[PDB]
Design a protein around this ligand. Structure first.
Ligand code: HEC
Ligand code: HEM
Ligand code: HEM
Lengths: 78, 49, 111, 82, 64, 241, 379
C-alpha cells in the first residue's frame, strides 16, 4: 500500500521497519509501557501549567519496542 | 678458514668442519631468500611456485 | 590464657584461637616450624649462626623440602604436617640473647 | 650484580635425585592430579579472595541501580485532579 | 635411522646435527608459511562468502 | 536530568569476531553519501581512491571523482582555477569554513562523518537508531524553530531534519530504497569510512588465533620438558646418626 | 682453552646476570611480570619510533597526521594500536609488579623498591604526556583538567602551570613540548631499569614462601628463560587480542573528534590506568587537598617499607593480612570503577568511602594486622 506500480494506487514496498514496529506494540512489555504513556498525557495535557511532560514514559516505551525490532529487523532488509 | 696456520693438523681440522660449514651457508642462503621471497630463487621450488 | 586480650575470644574460649590460626597460617602444611619462616634481618642472621650443627642442618632440609613443595604448588600429606603442640621454638633462646646483646650495645652508645 | 654458586650457603647431608628430561613424560598425570590439586588450591584461597570482590559486585549492583533510580523522576503535582 | 618409528628416523636424519636442525627450521618455515596463508585464508573467505570485494568483482570490469 | 536512551544492539554482517564488511552494502552506502550526506556533511579523510578495491573499481572511481569539479593548482598567471577531480582528491567539502556551515544551518555545525562511527558511543548502532529514531515530539515539549525531536540524540532536541525517507534516493542494483534499508547501507559505509582496516583486522586475527592456538601448547611443552627435571626430584636427608 | 672462562673481558660478564644468575626454584608466575615489563618497554619504543616517523607535533597537523598513519601508511594501522594497547598492557603489567611486592614483601629490598617507585612515576608521566599527542578532544581536555591541578600549589602554582603550558593554556606550544618530552623519557626508563636490576641482583630475588632461597637456587638460563618466553607469548596473545579484535575497547570514543577548546566533552576523564587516582582527587571538595591526596596515594608506596610489622616477610602464612590485601585490591577496583563515572549523589558517597578506606587500610589496618598475628604466634 504505497505509490510504486500496479493498481490500488500503485504498490511501493511499505517499509519493513513500520511492519516490524507494529509487530511489537502488542507485546506485554511494550503495552504496559505504552499504558503508562497514556495516563501521563492526560495529566499533562489537561494541566493548566506544569513542567512535566511525557517523554520518559515514551522513552521506556521506546526502549522496550526498539530492543524488539533490532532482533527481527535485518532479516527483511536486503 | 676455521684454522690458524697452514699445516696438516689444521688441514684435517678444516676438512672435518667443511660439511657443517657446507650446510651452514644454506641457512644464510635459504633464510635470506625466505626473508625477502627472493623470486629468482622462489621460482624454482615446485610447491612454492 | 591465649588468643586475645579479652578473657574469651569471638569464636569461643581463648586458647583455641591460636590453634585455629596455626592451621590457618599453613606453614605446617609445608613441613616448616614457626621459626623456619621468620624474617632474616641483621639480628636473626647472627642468631642463626649460633645454631648447633644438628639443629642448623635440620632447618636447612626443612626449608629445602618446603621450597620443593612450593615449587610444585603442593603440600605434605595429612600425617606429615607440623603439629601445633609439637612445634617448639628452636630459635627463641638464641634470639633473646641477641636481643639482650643488641639492647646493651645500643644503650651503651647513648650515655 | 654479584654472588654466584659456590658461596651461597652451607648445605650438608642432603641427597637429591633427578631424571633426564628425555627419560620422563613432560605432562605426567595432568588431569589425574592437576585438577584435584587446583580444587585444593582454590579452596585454600577462596575464603580470603572471594569475599573482598563479592562486596565490590554488591556495590556495583547497588551504586548502578541507585544512579538510574535517582535519574528517574517522582510525581510532583501541586494542584490538579488528572 | 634403523628404527620402525617415524620420529627416530626424523631425529637421526635431521635433528642429530645442529647444522641440519636449522635447515629444517628455515625450510619448514618456507613450506609452513606458504600453506598456512592459503589454509588460513580459504577458511576466512568461507565465513564471508559473497561479502568481500573478491566475491562481487565479477559483476564489474566489463569484459573481464 | 535528560535521561539517555540506550541504542539497541542491531545485528550486523560485521558484528562477529571474524565477520567482515558486506562490500555490496558499502557500495550502496556510498550512494547515500554522494546524494544525501554530502549535501551538508563533510568527509575530509576519505579520498576517491580509497573506494578502489572496496566498493568501486578503478574505472568506476575515476568516473566518480571526475564527476565533481575541484579547485586546486595555482595557474601560471597566479590565480585559482577549477578542474575535474582525480582519484587522489578527498571528498568535496560542502562549505569552506565551519562558520559558513553554521550559517547554512540553524547554527548547528554538521560533524565530520569520517570518524562519526568511532567518535560516538554505541557505534553504528546509535547512528542507525538515530537516523530511524525520529518521532513526533511528546505532549508537553516546546521545540525551537529549526530543532527536531530525536530521542537517541542526547538532549532529545537535534538540529538535523530527518534526512532519510522512503525512496529518498535510487540504488544502482535496485534494492528497495526504504528508510530502514538506506540507513543500514550508510551505517555500513560509515563504519568502513571510520575503520578501513576492518577486514584486515580480522584477517590477521584469524591467523593469530590459528598461530597462538598451535604455538601455546608447543611452547608450554618446552617449558614442561625443561622443568620436568625439578618437578620429578626426590630429596633425602641422611644426617650422621 | 677453558670453555667456562669465556670471552669474559667483555660485556658478557654483565650478561652472566641473565644466564648463570642464581634464582629461587619456587618462583611463581607472578614474577614473570618483571620480564614482561622489559618487553613492554622495548615494544613501546619499537612501535613509538616508527610512529614518530609520521607524527607531526604542530596543532594544525597533529590529529590529521594520526589519521594519515592509519589510512595511508602501509600496515601503519596496527602499529598505532599496539602502541595504544601496549600502554594498556604496560599498566596491566605495572600494577601486578607492584602488587606482588605488596603481597610477597619485596619492599624489604629498600634500594630496589625505591627505584621501583621512581620507575612507576616516570611511566605515568610518559603515558600522560603521550595521551595528549593525538590531540583529539580527549587529549586536549584530559590534559586541561589534570595540568590545571598544579594551579592549587600556593605562591608558585600559576608560575609553573604556565611554565608547563608554554603560554596561558594548552596549545600548540604545549603539544610540541610533550612530543619531545615523550620521546626522551622512555630512554630514561631504560637507564633506571638497569639501575633497578643493579640494586636487586646484589641481594638476589624473593620467593612466595618469603624465606631465604639460598639453599635451593637454580640457574636462570634453562629454567626461567623458557618460563619468560611462555610468559611473553601470553602477553603478546593478550595485547594482540585487543589490537586485532577490539582496538578501541579501552580507549574512549570521544578521542576521535579533533580538539576544540571552545567545546567540552560530555564527560571528562583520563585513561583507565589513572581513573583510580582521579577518584581520590575528586573525593575532597578542596582543591589543595585533592592534588595532595592524588600525589600522596601514588607516593604512599615509598612509605610501605616503613610500615612493616609482621615477623614474616611474605603474606603466604599471614591469613589476616591476606583478607586485607584483597580488600585493598577490591577497593582499588572500586576506585577504578567510580573514576569513570560522573560526580553524582551515589558516587559522591561511595567515592569518599572508597578513598578513605584506601588510606585507612594501608596506614592503619595493615600494620595492625601484622601486630595482631605477631601476638598470635608467640612472638
Ligand atoms: C539538512 C542538512 C543535513 C543533512 C542532509 C544531513 N545532516 Fe546530519 N546533521 C546536520 C546538522 C546541522 C547536525 C548537527 C545537529 C546538532 O548538533 O544539533 C547533524 C548531525 C549529524 C550527526 C551527529 C549526531 C550526533 O549526535 O553527533 C550524524 C551522525 C549525522 N548527522 C548523520 C547524517 C547522515 C547519515 C545523513 C545522510 C542520511 C545526514 N546526517 C544528512 C545536517 C544534515
Ligand atoms: C614507556 C614508554 C611509552 C608509553 C607508556 C607511551 C604511551 C603512549 C600513549 C598512552 C599514547 C596514546 C595513544 C592513544 O591514546 O591513541 C601514546 C601516543 C604516542 N606515542 Fe607513546 N608511549 C611511550 C613511548 C613512546 C616513544 C619512545 C615514542 C617515540 C619514539 C612514542 C611516540 C608516540 C606517538 C607519536 C604517539 C601519538 C601517535 C598515537 O597516539 O598513535 N611513544 N604513547
Ligand atoms: C618499566 C618499569 C619496570 C621495569 C622494567 C622493572 C623491572 C624489574 C625486573 C625485571 C625485576 C626482576 C623480575 C622479578 O624479580 O620478578 C624487578 C624487580 C623488582 N621491581 Fe621492578 N620494574 C619496573 C617497575 C617497578 C615498579 C613500578 C615497582 C613498584 C614497587 C618495582 C619494584 C620492584 C621490586 C620490589 C622488585 C623485587 C623483585 C623480587 O623481590 O624478586 N619495579 N623489576
Amino acid at each position: 500500500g504505497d505509490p510504486k506500480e500496479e493498481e490500488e494506487e500503485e504498490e511501493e514496498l511499505v517499509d519493513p521497519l513500520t511492519t516490524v514496529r507494529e509487530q511489537c506494540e502488542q507485546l506485554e512489555k511494550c503495552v504496559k509501557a505504552r499504558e503508562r504513556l497514556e495516563l501521563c498525557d492526560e495529566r499533562v495535557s489537561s494541566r493548566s501549567q506544569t513542567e512535566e511532560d511525557c517523554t520518559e514514559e515514551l522513552l521506556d516505551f521506546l526502549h522496550a519496542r526498539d530492543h524488539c525490532v533490532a532482533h527481527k529487523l535485518f532479516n527483511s532488509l536486503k | 678458514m676455521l684454522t690458524r696456520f697452514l699445516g696438516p693438523r689444521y688441514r684435517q681440522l678444516a676438512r672435518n668442519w667443511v660439511p657443517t660449514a657446507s650446510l651452514w651457508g644454506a641457512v644464510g642462503a635459504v633464510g635470506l631468500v625466505w626473508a625477502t621471497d627472493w623470486r629468482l630463487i622462489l621460482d624454482w621450488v615446485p610447491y612454492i611456485n | 590464657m591465649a588468643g586475645r586480650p579479652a578473657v574469651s575470644a569471638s569464636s569461643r574460649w581463648l586458647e583455641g584461637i591460636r590453634k585455629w590460626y596455626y592451621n590457618a597460617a599453613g606453614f605446617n602444611k609445608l613441613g616448616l616450624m614457626r621459626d623456619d619462616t621468620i624474617h632474616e634481618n641483621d639480628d636473626v642472621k647472627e642468631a642463626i649462626r649460633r645454631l648447633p650443627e644438628n639443629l642448623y642442618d635440620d632447618r636447612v632440609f626443612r626449608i629445602k623440602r618446603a621450597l620443593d613443595l612450593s615449587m610444585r604448588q603442593q603440600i605434605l600429606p595429612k600425617e606429615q604436617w607440623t603439629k601445633y603442640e609439637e612445634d617448639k621454638s628452636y630459635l627463641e633462646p638464641y634470639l633473646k640473647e641477641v636481643i639482650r646483646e643488641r639492647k646493651e650495645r645500643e644503650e651503651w652508645a647513648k650515655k | 650484580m654479584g654472588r654466584q654458586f659456590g658461596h651461597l650457603t652451607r648445605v650438608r647431608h642432603v641427597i637429591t635425585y633427578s631424571l633426564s628430561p628425555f627419560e620422563q613424560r613432560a605432562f605426567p598425570h595432568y588431569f589425574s592430579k592437576g585438577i584435584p590439586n587446583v580444587l585444593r588450591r582454590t579452596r585454600a584461597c577462596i575464603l580470603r579472595v572471594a569475599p573482598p570482590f563479592v562486596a565490590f559486585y554488591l556495590v556495583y549492583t547497588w551504586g548502578t541501580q541507585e544512579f538510574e533510580k535517582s535519574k528517574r523522576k517522582n510525581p510532583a503535582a501541586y494542584e490538579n485532579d488528572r | 635411522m634403523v628404527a620402525p618409528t617415524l620420529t627416530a628416523r626424523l631425529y637421526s636424519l635431521l635433528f642429530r646435527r645442529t647444522s641440519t636442525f636449522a635447515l629444517t627450521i628455515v625450510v619448514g618455515a618456507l613450506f609452513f608459511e606458504r600453506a598456512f596463508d592459503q589454509g588460513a585464508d580459504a577458511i576466512y573467505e568461507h565465513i564471508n562468502e559473497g561479502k568481500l570485494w573478491k566475491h562481487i568483482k565479477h559483476k564489474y570490469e566489463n569484459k573481464e | 536530568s535528560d535521561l539517555e536512551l540506550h541504542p539497541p544492539s542491531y545485528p550486523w554482517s560485521h558484528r562477529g569476531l571474524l565477520s567482515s564488511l558486506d562490500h555490496t552494502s558499502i557500495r550502496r552506502g556510498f550512494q547515500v553519501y554522494k546524494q544525501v550526506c554530502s549535501s551538508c556533511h563533510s568527509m575530509d579523510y576519505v579520498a576517491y581512491r580509497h573506494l578502489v578495491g572496496v566498493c568501486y573499481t578503478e574505472d568506476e572511481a575515476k568516473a566518480l571523482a571526475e564527476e565533481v569539479e575541484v579547485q586546486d593548482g595555482p595557474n601560471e598567471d597566479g590565480e585559482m582555477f577549477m578542474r575535474p577531480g582525480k582519484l587522489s582528491d578527498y571528498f568535496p567539502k560542502p562549505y569552506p569554513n565551519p562558520e559558513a556551515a553554521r550559517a547554512a544551518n540553524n547554527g548547528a555545525l554538521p560533524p565530520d562523518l569520517s570518524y562519526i562511527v568511532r567518535a560516538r558511543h554505541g557505534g553504528e548502532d546509535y547512528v542507525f537508531s538515530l537516523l530511524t529514531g525520529y518521532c513526533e515530539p511528546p505532549t508537553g515539549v516546546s521545540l525551537r524553530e529549526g530543532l527536531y525531536f530525536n530521542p537517541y540524540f542526547p538532549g532529545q532536541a537535534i538540529g538535523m531534519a530527518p534526512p532519510i525517507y522512503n525512496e529518498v534516493l535510487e540504488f544502482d542494483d535496485g534494492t528497495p530504497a526504504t528508510m530502514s534499508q538506506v540507513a543500514k547501507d550508510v551505517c555500513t559505509f560509515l563504519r568502513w569510512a571510520a575503520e578501513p582496516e576492518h577486514d584486515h583486522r580480522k584477517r590477521m586475527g584469524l591467523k593469530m588465533l590459528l598461530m597462538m592456538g598451535l604455538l601455546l601448547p608447543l611452547v608450554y611443552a618446552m617449558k614442561r620438558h625443561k622443568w620436568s627435571v625439578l618437578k620429578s626430584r626426590k630429596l633425602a636427608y641422611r644426617p650422621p646418626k | 682453552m677453558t670453555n667456562i672462562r669465556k670471552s669474559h673481558p667483555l660485556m658478557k660478564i654483565v650478561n652472566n646476570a641473565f644466564i648463570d644468575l642464581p634464582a629461587p626454584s619456587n618462583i611463581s608466575s607472578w614474577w614473570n611480570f618483571g620480564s614482561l615489563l622489559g618487553i613492554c618497554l622495548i615494544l613501546q619504543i619499537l612501535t613509538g619510533l616508527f610512529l614518530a616517523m609520521h607524527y607531526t607535533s604542530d596543532t594544525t597537523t597533529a590529529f590529521s597526521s594520526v589519521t594519515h598513519i592509519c589510512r595511508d601508511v602501509n600496515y601503519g594501522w596496527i602499529i598505532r594500536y599496539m602502541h595504544a594497547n601496549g600502554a594498556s598492557m604496560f599498566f596491566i603489567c605495572l600494577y601486578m609488579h607492584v602488587g606482588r611486592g605488596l603481597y610477597y614483601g619485596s619492599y624489604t629490598f629498600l634500594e630496589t623498591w625505591n627505584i621501583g617507585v621512581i620507575l612507576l612515576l616516570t611511566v605515568m608521566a610518559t603515558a600522560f604526556m603521550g595521551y595528549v599527542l593525538p590531540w583529539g578532544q580527549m587529549s586536549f581536555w584530559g590534559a586541561t583538567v589534570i595540568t590545571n591541578l598544579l594551579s592549587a600549589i600556593p605562591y608558585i602554582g600559576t608560575n609553573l602551570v604556565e611554565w608547563i603550558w608554554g603560554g596561558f593554556s594548552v596549545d600548540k606550544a604545549t603539544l610540541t613540548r610533550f612530543f619531545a618530552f615523550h620521546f626522551i623519557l622512555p630512554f630514561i626508563i631504560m637507564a633506571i631499569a638497569m639501575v633497578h636490576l643493579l640494586f636487586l641482583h646484589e641481594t638476589g630475588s624473593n620467593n612466595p614462601t618469603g624465606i631465604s632461597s639460598d639453599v635451593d637456587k637454580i640457574p636462570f638460563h634453562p629454567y626461567y628463560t623458557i618460563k619468560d618466553i611462555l610468559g611473553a607469548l601470553l602477553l603478546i596473545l593478550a595485547l594482540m587480542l585487543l589490537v586485532l579484535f577490539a582496538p578501541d575497547l579501552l580507549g574512549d570514543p570521544d578521542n576521535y573528534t579533533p580538539a576544540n577548546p571552545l567545546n567540552t566533552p560530555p564527560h571528562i576523564k583520563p585513561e583507565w590506568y589513572f581513573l583510580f587516582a582521579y577518584a581520590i582527587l575528586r573525593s575532597i571538595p578542596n582543591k589543595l587537598g585533592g592534588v595532595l591526596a592524588l600525589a600522596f596515594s601514588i607516593l604512599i608506596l615509598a612509605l610501605i617499607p616503613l610500615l612493616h610489622t609482621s615477623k614474616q616477610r611474605s603474606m603466604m602464612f599471614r591469613p589476616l593480612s591476606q583478607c586485607l590485601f584483597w580488600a585493598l585490591v577490591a577497593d582499588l577496583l572500586t576506585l577504578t570503577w567510580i573514576g569513570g563515572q560522573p560526580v553524582e549523589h551515589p558516587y559522591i558517597t561511595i567515592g569518599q568511602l572508597a578513598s578513605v578506606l584506601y588510606f585507612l587500610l594501608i596506614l592503619v589496618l595493615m600494620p595492625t594486622a601484622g601486630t595482631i598475628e605477631n601476638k598470635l604466634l608467640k612472638w
